[PDB]
């Protein structure tokens, strides 16, 4: 579920450079990468 959390990342300027990376909004990796949709699950439960 932690991976399903849509984390928001602010705009930061990396040290020792003039690059300012874009912020990330509602960054739910488990879902924004399609894994939630692909596997139909928000976690991993395995029974062998």
């Amino acid at each position: 579920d932690f991976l399903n959390i849509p984390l928001t990342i602010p705009e930061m300027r990396l040290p020792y450079t003039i690059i300012t990376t874009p912020p990330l909004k509602d960054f739910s990796l488990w879902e924004k990468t399609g894994l939630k949709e692909f596997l139909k699950t928000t976690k991993q439960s395995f029974d062998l």
Binding site: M12, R13, L14, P15, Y16, T17, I18
Partner: protein, 48 residues
């Protein structure tokens, strides 16, 4: 004369380029710019 102008312009641009970035550390609360971090180091080094 032309190279004189170019070199002085390069130094002037380099000053701002060095001052541009920002700094963040886990042990030091907050995000520090170049001059703020330099000032903090000056004070701490001098007193210690």
């Amino acid at each position: 004369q032309e190279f004189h102008m170019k070199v002085k312009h390069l130094i002037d641009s380099l000053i701002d380029f060095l001052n541009f970035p920002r700094f963040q550390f886990p042990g030091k609360p907050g995000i520090y710019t170049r001059e703020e971090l330099c000032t903090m180091f000056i004070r701490e080094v001098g007193t210690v």
